[PDB]
Structure formats: structure tokens, C-alpha cells
Design a protein around this ligand. Structure first.
Ligand SMILES: O=C(O)c1ccccc1C(=O)NCc1c(Cl)cccc1Sc1ccc(Cl)cc1Cl
Ligand SMILES: [Mg+2]
Ligand SMILES: [Mg+2]
Length: 284
């Protein structure tokens, strides 16, 4: 294996460690496309984890400067300040694909902002957050997952990303609360008469379930709209994206089956993923 092979294998390790679902689906892409996804995934993960390395924005600033170096001089040799393996792989991708760098900067700005997290007043603010951490990622992936990017391709990829984030939120209510984070909006919490701290201590109730299902209906409708527009993506990526999406839709049912528990993280069995892919592939 070459040095560059090693860099990509490391990016892959980071992705599989963080998400079995996404790795399962994306590893099914053709070699050059899946490697590009690994690199983008590893960069975004490093960004999300950056603050906790020392406890401030040092490492994140270094990541940002590395990405700016690649943007400005794609073909020059760089001595990277952050994670060399990841940045070398990213640069390799950037030489072959049109990366939306401002989308990385948007993600980084969202992470900076998260240092002074205050709850969202409205769902509009929640959805803006979903764009920031996940719609941005869809934008970056767009040139990898489509042959000819148009505004529709970015729109669909952005919507998919934001739907996946909403599902993450719906899965992780309990864990996020423990980490002093609540992502449901103050408007919606008040409208449904829900107090997460109260639910965390005393268990689910009908008001909570209604609030949860309100957001779940949103994620579900977005997912359906992505599915109706699946053809914006390359023929090879279409079944993979459908699979990633369908696995995440299944997380919602796992939550329901676990009675919306705030005290464990539910998941889709690896064997159940394989089943969904069989069902999808047949159609392809
Ligand atoms: O989920 C967090 O905790 C988080 C918080 C902030 C930043 C990143 C993440 C994060 O783990 N993102 C997962 C991810 C990365 Cl990282 C790389 C590539 C793909 C994906 S999954 C995907 C597939 C399709 C679309 Cl349209 C959008 C996405 Cl997100
Ligand atoms: Mg996160
Ligand atoms: Mg989360």
C-alpha cells in the first residue's frame, strides 16, 4: 500500500468508528467515490471533535487554516497544522473534485457558535442549526455523489443532510440532555407543555410523545421528498443514498419500539441493515 492509501484507510477507520450505518452504506460506493467520502467524513468528524482536544478553539483554528491552504493552493505541498493524514487525503480529493469550501467554513462557524450554545427560540433556528452541521456536509458531498451538479442536486443533498440530523436529534434526546444540550425549540416545547429535564427524571408522557412525533413527521416528509428526487444523483450512488436514508428512517421505529427512552441509544441491527439493502437492491 502507498502512503496515500494509508491516509485514506485512516479516514475510513474514523468513519466506521463513528457510524456503522453510514460506513455500511457508503463503503458500497465504487472505490474512488467511497475514498472521497471517507476523507470528507473524517474532516467533518475532526471539526466536530475539535473543541474537546484542549478545551478551546486552538485545534479548530488549525483545521480551518489547513482547509484554507488547500483551497488557495490545491497543488502545492503543505505542512499541515492539524491532522496530516486527513488533510493530505482531503487535498487529494480537492485536486479531482470541485469542493464547496464555503460549506466547510459554514460547518466550522456552526461549531464555533456551539461553544456559546443557547437553546433555539424557534424551529427556524433549529433548522438553521441542522443546515450548519449537516446540510453543509451534504453540499460538500454533492460533487462526489453526482455527475453533473445543479442547484437541484445541492438542494436535495442539503435536505437529506438536514433530515439525517433531525433523526440524530430524535435518537439522542437523552444523551444530549446529559451533555446539557436540548435541540427542540423553546416555542415547540412550550406549545406541547414539555420539560426535557422533567421527562428525563420521570419518564415519557403523552405530551412528550406528541412533540417527538411532530419532529419525526418532519424528518419523514423530508426523506420522502429526497426519495422522490433520487435521480439527481449518479446511478451508482442512488441505491447507496436510498440505503443510508432507509437505515436512518428505521432508527425512528427503533425509538418507538424502545418507548422513546431517554436512557439508552437505540440502533438498527447490522443484520437488519443487510435486509433493507436486499429490499432496495432488488429494485435496482
Ligand atoms: O452528526 C454529527 O454529530 C455531526 C455534527 C457536525 C458535523 C458532522 C457531524 C457528522 O458526524 N456527520 C456525518 C457525516 C460526515 Cl461527518 C461526513 C460525511 C457524511 C456524513 S453522514 C451524511 C450523509 C449525507 C448527508 Cl446529505 C449528510 C450527512 Cl451528515
Ligand atoms: Mg455533534
Ligand atoms: Mg447529536
Amino acid at each position: 500500500m502507498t502512503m496515500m492509501d494509508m491516509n485514506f484507510k485512516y479516514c475510513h477507520k474514523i468513519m466506521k468508528k463513528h457510524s456503522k450505518s453510514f460506513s455500511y452504506a457508503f463503503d458500497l460506493l465504487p472505490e474512488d467515490q467511497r475514498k472521497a467520502v471517507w476523507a470528507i467524513y473524517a474532516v467533518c468528524r475532526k471539526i466536530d471533535d475539535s473543541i474537546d482536544v484542549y478545551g478551546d478553539i486552538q485545534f479548530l483554528n488549525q483545521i480551518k487554516e489547513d482547509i484554507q491552504s488547500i483551497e488557495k493552493y490545491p497543488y502545492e505541498y503543505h505542512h499541515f497544522q492539524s491532522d496530516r493524514r486527513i488533510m493530505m487525503a482531503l487535498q487529494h480529493v480537492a485536486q479531482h473534485k470541485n469542493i464547496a469550501f464555503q460549506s466547510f467554513y459554514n460547518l466550522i462557524d456552526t461549531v464555533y457558535k456551539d461553544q456559546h450554545f443557547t437553546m433555539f427560540e424557534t424551529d427556524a433556528e433549529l433548522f438553521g442549526y441542522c443546515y450548519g452541521v449537516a446540510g453543509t456536509v451534504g453540499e460538500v458531498l454533492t460533487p462526489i455523489l453526482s455527475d453533473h451538479e445543479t442547484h437541484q442536486t445541492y438542494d436535495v443533498a442539503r435536505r437529506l443532510g438536514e433530515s439525517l440530523q433531525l433523526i440524530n436529534i430524535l435518537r439522542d434526546v437523552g444523551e444530549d440532555f446529559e451533555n446539557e444540550r436540548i435541540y427542540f425549540s423553546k416555542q415547540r416545547l412550550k406549545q406541547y407543555e414539555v420539560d426535557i429535564a422533567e421527562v428525563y427524571q420521570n419518564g415519557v408522557n403523552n405530551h412528550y410523545i406528541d412533540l417527538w412525533e411532530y419532529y419525526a413527521a418532519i424528518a419523514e416528509k423530508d426523506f420522502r421528498d429526497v426519495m422522490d428526487q433520487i435521480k439527481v444523483f449518479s446511478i451508482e450512488a442512488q441505491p447507496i443514498i436510498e440505503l443510508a436514508a432507509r437505515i436512518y428512517i428505521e432508527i425512528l421505529d427503533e425509538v418507538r419500539q424502545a418507548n422513546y427512552t431517554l436512557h439508552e441509544r437505540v440502533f438498527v441491527e447490522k443484520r437488519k441493515k443487510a435486509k433493507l439493502f436486499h429490499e432496495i437492491n432488488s429494485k435496482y
